[PDB]
mmCIF file of the N, C-alpha and C atoms, coordinates in Angstrom:
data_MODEL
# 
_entry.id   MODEL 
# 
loop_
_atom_site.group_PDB 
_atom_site.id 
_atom_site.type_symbol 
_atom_site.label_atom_id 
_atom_site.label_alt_id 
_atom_site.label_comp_id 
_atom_site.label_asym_id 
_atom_site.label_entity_id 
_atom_site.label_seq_id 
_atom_site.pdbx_PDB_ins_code 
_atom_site.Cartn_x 
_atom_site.Cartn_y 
_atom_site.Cartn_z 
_atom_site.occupancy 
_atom_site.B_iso_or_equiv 
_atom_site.pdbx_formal_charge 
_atom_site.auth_seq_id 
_atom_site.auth_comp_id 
_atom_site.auth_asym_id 
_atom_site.auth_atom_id 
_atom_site.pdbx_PDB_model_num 
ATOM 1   N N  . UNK A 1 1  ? 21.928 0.884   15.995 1.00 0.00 ? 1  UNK A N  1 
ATOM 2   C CA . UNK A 1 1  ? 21.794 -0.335  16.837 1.00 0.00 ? 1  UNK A CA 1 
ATOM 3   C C  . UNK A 1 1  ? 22.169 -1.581  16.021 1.00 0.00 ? 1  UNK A C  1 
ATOM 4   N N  . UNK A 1 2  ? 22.418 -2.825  16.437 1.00 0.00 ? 2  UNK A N  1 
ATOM 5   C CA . UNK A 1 2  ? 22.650 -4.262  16.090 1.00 0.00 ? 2  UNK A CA 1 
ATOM 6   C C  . UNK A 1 2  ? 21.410 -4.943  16.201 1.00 0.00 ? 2  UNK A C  1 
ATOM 7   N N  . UNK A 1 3  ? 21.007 -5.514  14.608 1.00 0.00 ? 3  UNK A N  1 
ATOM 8   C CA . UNK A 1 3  ? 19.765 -6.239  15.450 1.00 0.00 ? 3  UNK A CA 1 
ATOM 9   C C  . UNK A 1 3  ? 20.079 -7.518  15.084 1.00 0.00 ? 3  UNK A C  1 
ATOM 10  N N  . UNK A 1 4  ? 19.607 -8.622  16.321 1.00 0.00 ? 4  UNK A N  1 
ATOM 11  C CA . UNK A 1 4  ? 19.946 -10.008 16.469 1.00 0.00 ? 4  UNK A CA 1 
ATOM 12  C C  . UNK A 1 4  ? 18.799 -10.702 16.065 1.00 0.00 ? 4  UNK A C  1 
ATOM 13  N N  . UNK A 1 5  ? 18.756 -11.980 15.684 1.00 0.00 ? 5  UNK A N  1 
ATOM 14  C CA . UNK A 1 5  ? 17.981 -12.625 15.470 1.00 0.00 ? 5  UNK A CA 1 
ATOM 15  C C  . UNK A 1 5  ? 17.135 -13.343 16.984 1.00 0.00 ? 5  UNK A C  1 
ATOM 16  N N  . UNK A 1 6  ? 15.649 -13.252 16.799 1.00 0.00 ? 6  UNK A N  1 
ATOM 17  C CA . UNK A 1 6  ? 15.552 -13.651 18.467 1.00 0.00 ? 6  UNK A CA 1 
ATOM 18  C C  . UNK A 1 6  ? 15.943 -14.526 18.860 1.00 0.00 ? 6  UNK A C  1 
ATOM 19  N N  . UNK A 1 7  ? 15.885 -16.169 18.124 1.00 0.00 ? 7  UNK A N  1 
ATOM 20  C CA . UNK A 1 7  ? 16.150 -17.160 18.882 1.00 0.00 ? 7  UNK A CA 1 
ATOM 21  C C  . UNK A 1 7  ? 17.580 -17.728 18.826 1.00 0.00 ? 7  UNK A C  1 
ATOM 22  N N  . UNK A 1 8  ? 18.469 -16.453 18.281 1.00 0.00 ? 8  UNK A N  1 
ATOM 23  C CA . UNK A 1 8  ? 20.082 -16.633 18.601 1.00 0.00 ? 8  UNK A CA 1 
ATOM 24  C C  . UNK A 1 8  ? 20.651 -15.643 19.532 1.00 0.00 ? 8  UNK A C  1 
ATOM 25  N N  . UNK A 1 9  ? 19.452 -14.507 19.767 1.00 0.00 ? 9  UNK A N  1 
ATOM 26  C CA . UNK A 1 9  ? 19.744 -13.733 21.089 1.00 0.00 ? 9  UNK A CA 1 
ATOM 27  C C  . UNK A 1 9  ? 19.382 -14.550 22.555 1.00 0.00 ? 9  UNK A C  1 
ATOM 28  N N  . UNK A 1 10 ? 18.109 -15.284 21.944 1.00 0.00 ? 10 UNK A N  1 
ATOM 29  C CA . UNK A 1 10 ? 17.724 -16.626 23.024 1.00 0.00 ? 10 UNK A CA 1 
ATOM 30  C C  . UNK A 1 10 ? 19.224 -17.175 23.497 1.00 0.00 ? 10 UNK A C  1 
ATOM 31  N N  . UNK A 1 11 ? 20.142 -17.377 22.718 1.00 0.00 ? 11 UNK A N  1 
ATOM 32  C CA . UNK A 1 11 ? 21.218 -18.808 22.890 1.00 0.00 ? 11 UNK A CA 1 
ATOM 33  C C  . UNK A 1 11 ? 22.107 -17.867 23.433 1.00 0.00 ? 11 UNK A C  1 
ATOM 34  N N  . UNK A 1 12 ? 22.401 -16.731 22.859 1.00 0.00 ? 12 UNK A N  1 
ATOM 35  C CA . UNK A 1 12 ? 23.875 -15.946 23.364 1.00 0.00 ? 12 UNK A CA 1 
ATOM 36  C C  . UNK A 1 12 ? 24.096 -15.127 24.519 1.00 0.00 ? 12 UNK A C  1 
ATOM 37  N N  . UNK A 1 13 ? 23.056 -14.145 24.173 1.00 0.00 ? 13 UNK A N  1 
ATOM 38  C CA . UNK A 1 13 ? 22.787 -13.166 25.376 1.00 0.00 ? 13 UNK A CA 1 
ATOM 39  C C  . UNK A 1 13 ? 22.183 -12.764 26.364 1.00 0.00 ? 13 UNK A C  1 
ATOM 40  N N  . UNK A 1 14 ? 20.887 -13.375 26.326 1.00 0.00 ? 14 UNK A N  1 
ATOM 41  C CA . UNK A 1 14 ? 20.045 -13.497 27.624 1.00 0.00 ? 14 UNK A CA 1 
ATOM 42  C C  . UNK A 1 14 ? 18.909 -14.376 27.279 1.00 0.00 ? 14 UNK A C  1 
ATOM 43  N N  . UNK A 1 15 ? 17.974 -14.969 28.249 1.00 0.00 ? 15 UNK A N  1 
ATOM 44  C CA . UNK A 1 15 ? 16.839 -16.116 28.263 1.00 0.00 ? 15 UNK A CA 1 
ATOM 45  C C  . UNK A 1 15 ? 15.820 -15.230 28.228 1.00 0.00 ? 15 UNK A C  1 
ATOM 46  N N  . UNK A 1 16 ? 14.810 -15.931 27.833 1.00 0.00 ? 16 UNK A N  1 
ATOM 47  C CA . UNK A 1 16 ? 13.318 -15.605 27.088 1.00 0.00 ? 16 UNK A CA 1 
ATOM 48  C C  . UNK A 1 16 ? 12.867 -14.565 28.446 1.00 0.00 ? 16 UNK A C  1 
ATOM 49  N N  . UNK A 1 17 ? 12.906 -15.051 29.656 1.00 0.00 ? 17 UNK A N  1 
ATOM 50  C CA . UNK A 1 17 ? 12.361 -14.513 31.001 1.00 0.00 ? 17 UNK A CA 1 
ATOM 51  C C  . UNK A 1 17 ? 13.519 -13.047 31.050 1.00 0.00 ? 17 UNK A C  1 
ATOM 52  N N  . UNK A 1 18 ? 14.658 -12.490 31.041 1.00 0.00 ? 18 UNK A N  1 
ATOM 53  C CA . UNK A 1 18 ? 15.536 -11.535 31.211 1.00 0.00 ? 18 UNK A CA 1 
ATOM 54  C C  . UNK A 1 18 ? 15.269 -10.723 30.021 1.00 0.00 ? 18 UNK A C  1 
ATOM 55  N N  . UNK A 1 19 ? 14.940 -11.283 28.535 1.00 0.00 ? 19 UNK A N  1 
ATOM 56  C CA . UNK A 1 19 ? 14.402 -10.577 27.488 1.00 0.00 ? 19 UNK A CA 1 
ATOM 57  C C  . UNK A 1 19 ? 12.835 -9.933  27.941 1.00 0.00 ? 19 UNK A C  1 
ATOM 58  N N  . UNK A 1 20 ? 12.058 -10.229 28.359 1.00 0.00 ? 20 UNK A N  1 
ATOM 59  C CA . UNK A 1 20 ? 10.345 -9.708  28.883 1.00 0.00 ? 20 UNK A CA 1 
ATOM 60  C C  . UNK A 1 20 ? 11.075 -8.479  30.047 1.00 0.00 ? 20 UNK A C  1 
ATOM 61  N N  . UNK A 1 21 ? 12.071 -8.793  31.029 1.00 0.00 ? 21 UNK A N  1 
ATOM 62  C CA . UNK A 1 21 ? 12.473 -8.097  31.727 1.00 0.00 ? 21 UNK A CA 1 
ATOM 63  C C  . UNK A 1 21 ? 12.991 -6.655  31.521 1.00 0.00 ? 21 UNK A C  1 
ATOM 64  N N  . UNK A 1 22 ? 13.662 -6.670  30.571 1.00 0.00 ? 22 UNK A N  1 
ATOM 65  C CA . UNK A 1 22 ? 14.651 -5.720  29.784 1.00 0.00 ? 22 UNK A CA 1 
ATOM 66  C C  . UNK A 1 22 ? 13.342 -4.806  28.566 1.00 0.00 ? 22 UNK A C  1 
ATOM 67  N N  . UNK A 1 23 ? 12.242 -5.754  27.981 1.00 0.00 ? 23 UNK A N  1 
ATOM 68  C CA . UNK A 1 23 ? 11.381 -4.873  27.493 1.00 0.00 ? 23 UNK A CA 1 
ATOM 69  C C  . UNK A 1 23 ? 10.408 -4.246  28.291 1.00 0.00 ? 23 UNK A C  1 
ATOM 70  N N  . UNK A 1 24 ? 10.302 -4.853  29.540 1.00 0.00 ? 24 UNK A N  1 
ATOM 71  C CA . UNK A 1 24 ? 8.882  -4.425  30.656 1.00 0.00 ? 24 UNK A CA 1 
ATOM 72  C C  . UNK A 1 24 ? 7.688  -4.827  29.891 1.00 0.00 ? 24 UNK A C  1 
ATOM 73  N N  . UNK A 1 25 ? 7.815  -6.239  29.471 1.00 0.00 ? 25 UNK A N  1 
ATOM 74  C CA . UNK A 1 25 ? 6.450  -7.097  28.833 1.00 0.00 ? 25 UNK A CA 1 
ATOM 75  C C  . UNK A 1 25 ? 6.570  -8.227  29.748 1.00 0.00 ? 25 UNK A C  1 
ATOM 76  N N  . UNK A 1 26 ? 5.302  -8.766  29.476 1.00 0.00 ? 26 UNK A N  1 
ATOM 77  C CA . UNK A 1 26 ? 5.066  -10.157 30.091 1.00 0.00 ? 26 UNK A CA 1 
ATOM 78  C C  . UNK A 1 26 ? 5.649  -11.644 28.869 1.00 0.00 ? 26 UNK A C  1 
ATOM 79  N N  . UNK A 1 27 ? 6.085  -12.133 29.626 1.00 0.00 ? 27 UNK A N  1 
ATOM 80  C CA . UNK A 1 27 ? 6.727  -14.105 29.383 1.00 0.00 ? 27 UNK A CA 1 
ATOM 81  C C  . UNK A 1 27 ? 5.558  -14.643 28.190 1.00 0.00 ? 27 UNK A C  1 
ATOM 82  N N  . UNK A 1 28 ? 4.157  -14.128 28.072 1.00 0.00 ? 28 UNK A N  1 
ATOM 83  C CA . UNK A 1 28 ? 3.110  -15.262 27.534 1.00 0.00 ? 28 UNK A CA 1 
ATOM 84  C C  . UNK A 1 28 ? 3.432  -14.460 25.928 1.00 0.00 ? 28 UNK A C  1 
ATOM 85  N N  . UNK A 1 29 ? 3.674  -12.811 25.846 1.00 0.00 ? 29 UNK A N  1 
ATOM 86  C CA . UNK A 1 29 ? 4.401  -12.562 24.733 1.00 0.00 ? 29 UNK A CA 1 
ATOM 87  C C  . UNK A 1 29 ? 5.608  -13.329 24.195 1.00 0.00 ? 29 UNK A C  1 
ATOM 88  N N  . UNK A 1 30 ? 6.639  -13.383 25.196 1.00 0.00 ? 30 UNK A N  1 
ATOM 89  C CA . UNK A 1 30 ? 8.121  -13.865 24.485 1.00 0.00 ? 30 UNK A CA 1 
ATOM 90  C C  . UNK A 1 30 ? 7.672  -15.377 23.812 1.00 0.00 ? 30 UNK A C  1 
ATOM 91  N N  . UNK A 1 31 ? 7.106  -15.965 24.822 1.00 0.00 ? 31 UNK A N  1 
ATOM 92  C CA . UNK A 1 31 ? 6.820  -17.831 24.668 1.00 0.00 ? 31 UNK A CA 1 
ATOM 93  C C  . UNK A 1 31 ? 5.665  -17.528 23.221 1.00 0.00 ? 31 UNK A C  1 
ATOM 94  N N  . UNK A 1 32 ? 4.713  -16.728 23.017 1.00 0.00 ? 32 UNK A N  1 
ATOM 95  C CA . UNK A 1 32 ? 3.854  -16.444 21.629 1.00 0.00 ? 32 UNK A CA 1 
ATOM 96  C C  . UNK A 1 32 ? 5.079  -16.432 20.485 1.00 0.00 ? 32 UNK A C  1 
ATOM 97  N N  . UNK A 1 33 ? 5.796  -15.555 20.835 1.00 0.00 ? 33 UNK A N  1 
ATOM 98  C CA . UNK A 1 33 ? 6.655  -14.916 19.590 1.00 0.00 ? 33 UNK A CA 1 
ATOM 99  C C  . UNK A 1 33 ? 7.429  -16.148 18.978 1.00 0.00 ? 33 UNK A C  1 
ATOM 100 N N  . UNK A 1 34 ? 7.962  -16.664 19.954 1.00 0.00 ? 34 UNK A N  1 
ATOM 101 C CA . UNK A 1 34 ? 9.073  -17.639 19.835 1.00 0.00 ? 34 UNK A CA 1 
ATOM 102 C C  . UNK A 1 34 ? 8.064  -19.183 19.157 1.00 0.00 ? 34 UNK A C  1 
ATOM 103 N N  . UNK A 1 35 ? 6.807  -19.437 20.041 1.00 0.00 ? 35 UNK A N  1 
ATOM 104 C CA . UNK A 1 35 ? 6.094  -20.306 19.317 1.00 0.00 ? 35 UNK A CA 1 
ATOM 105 C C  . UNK A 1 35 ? 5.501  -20.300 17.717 1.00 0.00 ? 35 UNK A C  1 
ATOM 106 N N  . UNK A 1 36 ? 5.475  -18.913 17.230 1.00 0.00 ? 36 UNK A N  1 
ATOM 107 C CA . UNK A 1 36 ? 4.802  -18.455 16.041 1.00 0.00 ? 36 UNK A CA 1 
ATOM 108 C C  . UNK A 1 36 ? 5.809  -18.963 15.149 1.00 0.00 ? 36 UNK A C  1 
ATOM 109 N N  . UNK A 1 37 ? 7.436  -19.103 15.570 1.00 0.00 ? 37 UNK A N  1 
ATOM 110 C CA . UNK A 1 37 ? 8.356  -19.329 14.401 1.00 0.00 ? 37 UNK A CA 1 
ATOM 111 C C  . UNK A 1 37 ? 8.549  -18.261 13.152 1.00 0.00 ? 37 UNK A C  1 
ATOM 112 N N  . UNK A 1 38 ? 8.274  -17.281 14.098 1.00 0.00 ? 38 UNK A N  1 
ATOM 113 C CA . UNK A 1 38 ? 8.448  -15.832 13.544 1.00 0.00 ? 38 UNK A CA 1 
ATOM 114 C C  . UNK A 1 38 ? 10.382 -15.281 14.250 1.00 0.00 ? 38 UNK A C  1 
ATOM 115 N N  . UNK A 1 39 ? 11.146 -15.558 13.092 1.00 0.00 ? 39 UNK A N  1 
ATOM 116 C CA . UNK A 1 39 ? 12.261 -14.723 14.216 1.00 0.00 ? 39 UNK A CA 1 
ATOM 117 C C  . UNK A 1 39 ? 11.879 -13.105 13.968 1.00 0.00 ? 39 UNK A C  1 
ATOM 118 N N  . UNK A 1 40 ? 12.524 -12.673 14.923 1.00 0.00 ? 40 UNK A N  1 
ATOM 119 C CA . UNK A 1 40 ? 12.245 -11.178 15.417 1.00 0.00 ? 40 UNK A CA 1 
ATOM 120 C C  . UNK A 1 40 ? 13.459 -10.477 15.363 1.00 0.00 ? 40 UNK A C  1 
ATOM 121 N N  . UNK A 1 41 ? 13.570 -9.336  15.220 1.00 0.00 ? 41 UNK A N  1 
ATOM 122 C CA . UNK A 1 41 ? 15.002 -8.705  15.148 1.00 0.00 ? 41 UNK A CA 1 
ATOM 123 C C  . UNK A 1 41 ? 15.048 -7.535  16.657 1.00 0.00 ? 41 UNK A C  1 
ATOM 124 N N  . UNK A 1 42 ? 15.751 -8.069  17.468 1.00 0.00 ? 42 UNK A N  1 
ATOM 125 C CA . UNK A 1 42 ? 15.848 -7.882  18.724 1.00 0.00 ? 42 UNK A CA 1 
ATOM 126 C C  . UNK A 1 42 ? 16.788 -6.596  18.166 1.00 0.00 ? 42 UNK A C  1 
ATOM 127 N N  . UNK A 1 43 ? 16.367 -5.271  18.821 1.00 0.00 ? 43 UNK A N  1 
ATOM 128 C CA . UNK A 1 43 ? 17.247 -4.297  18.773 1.00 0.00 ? 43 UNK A CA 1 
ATOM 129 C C  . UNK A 1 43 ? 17.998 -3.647  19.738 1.00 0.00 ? 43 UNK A C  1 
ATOM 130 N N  . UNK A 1 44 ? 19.556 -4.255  19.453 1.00 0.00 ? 44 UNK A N  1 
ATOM 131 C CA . UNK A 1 44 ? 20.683 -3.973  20.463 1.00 0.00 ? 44 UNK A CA 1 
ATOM 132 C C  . UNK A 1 44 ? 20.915 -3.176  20.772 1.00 0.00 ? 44 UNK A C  1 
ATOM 133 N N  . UNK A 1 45 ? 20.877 -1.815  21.410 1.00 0.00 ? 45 UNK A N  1 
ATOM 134 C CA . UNK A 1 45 ? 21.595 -1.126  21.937 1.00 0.00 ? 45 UNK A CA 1 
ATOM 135 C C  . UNK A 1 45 ? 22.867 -1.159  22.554 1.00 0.00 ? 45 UNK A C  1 
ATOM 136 N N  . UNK A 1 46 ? 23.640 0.192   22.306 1.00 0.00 ? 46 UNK A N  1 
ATOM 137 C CA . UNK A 1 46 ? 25.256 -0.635  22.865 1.00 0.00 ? 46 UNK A CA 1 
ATOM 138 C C  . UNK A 1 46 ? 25.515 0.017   24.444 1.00 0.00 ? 46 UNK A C  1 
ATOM 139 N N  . UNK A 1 47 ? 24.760 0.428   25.212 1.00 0.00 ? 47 UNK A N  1 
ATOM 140 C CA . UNK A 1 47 ? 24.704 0.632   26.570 1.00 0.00 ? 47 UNK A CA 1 
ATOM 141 C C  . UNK A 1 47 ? 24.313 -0.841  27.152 1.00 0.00 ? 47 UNK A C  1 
ATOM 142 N N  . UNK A 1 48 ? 23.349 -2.265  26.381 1.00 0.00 ? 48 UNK A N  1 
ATOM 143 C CA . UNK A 1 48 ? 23.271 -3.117  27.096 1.00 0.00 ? 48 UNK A CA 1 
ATOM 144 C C  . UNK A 1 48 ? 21.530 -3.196  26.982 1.00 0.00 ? 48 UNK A C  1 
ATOM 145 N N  . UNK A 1 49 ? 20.919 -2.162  26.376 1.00 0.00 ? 49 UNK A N  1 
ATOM 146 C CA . UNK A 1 49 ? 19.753 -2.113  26.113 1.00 0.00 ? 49 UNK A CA 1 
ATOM 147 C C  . UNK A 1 49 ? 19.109 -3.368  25.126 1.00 0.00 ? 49 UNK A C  1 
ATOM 148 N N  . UNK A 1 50 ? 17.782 -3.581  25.423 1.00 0.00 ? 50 UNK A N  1 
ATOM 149 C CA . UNK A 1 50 ? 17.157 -4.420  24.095 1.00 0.00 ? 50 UNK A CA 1 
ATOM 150 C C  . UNK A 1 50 ? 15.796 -3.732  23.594 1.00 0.00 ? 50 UNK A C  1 
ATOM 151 N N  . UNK A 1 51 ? 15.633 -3.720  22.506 1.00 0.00 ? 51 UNK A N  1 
ATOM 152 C CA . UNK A 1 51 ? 14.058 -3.738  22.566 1.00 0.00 ? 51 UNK A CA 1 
ATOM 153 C C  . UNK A 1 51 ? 13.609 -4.049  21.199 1.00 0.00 ? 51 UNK A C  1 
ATOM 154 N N  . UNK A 1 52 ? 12.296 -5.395  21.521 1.00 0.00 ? 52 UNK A N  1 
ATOM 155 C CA . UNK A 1 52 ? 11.261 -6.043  20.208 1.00 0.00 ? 52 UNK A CA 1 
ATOM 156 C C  . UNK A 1 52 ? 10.306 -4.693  19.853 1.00 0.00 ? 52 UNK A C  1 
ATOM 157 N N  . UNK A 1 53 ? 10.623 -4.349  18.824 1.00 0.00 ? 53 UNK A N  1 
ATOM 158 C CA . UNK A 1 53 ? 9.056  -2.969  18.025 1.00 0.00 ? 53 UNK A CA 1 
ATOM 159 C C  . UNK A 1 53 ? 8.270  -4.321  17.558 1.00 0.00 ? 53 UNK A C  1 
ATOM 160 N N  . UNK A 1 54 ? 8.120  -5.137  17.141 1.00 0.00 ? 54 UNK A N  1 
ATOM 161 C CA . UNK A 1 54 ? 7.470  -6.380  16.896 1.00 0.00 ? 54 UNK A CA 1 
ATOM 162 C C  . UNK A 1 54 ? 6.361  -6.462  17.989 1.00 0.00 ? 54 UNK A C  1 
ATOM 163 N N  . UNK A 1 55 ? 7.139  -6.379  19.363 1.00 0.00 ? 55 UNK A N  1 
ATOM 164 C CA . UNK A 1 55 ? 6.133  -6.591  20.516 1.00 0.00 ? 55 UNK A CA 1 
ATOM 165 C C  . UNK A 1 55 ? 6.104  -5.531  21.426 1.00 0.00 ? 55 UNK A C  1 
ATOM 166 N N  . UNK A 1 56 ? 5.060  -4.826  20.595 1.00 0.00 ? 56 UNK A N  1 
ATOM 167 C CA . UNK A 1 56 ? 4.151  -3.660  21.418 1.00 0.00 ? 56 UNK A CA 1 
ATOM 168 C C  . UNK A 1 56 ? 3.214  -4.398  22.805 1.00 0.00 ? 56 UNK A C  1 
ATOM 169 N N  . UNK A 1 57 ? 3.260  -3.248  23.949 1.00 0.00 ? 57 UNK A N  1 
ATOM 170 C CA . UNK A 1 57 ? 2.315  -3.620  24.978 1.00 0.00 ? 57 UNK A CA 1 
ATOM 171 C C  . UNK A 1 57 ? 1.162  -4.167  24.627 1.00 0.00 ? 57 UNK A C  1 
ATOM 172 N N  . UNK A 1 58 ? 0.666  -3.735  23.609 1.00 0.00 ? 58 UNK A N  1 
ATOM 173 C CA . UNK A 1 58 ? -0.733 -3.654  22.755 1.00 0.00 ? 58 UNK A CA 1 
ATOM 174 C C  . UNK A 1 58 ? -1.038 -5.129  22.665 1.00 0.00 ? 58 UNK A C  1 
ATOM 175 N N  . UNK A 1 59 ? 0.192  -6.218  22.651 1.00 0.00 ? 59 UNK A N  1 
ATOM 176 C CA . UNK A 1 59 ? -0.636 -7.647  22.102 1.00 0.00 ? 59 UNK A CA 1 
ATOM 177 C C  . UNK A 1 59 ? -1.036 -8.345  22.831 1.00 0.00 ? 59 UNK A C  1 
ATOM 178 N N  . UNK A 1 60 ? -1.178 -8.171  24.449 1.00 0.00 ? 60 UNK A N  1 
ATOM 179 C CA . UNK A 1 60 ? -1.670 -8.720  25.682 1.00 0.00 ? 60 UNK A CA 1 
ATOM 180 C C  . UNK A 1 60 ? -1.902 -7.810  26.399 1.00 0.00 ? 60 UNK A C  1 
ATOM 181 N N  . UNK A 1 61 ? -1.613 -6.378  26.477 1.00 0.00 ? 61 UNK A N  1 
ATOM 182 C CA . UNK A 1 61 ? -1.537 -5.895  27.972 1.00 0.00 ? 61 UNK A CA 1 
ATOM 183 C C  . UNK A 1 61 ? -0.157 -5.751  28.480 1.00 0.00 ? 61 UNK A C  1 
ATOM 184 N N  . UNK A 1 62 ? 0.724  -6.238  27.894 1.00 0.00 ? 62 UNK A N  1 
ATOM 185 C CA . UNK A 1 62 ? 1.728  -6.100  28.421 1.00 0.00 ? 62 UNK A CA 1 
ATOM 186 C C  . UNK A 1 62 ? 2.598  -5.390  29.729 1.00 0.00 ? 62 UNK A C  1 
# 
């Protein structure tokens, strides 16, 4: 896989709300992650896939 930096996957490839979509998490994760000033390494798949191991269901309920 390609992994992106989150808040330049933020700018290029999809918005914070289509990223929660694509992992099947909730928005109050992405907006945490992104507020912590933690970048994250978003893992690309080349079918079009994404997925944060950073953000397990586990940190809200997701």
């Amino acid at each position: 896989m390609k992994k992106i930096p989150l808040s330049k996957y933020l700018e290029e490839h999809g918005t914070q709300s289509a990223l929660a979509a694509a992992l099947g998490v909730n928005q109050s994760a992405i907006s945490q992650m992104v507020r912590a000033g933690r970048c994250i390494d978003i893992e690309l798949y080349t079918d079009g896939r994404v997925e944060c191991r950073e953000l397990r269901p586990d940190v809200f309920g997701a």
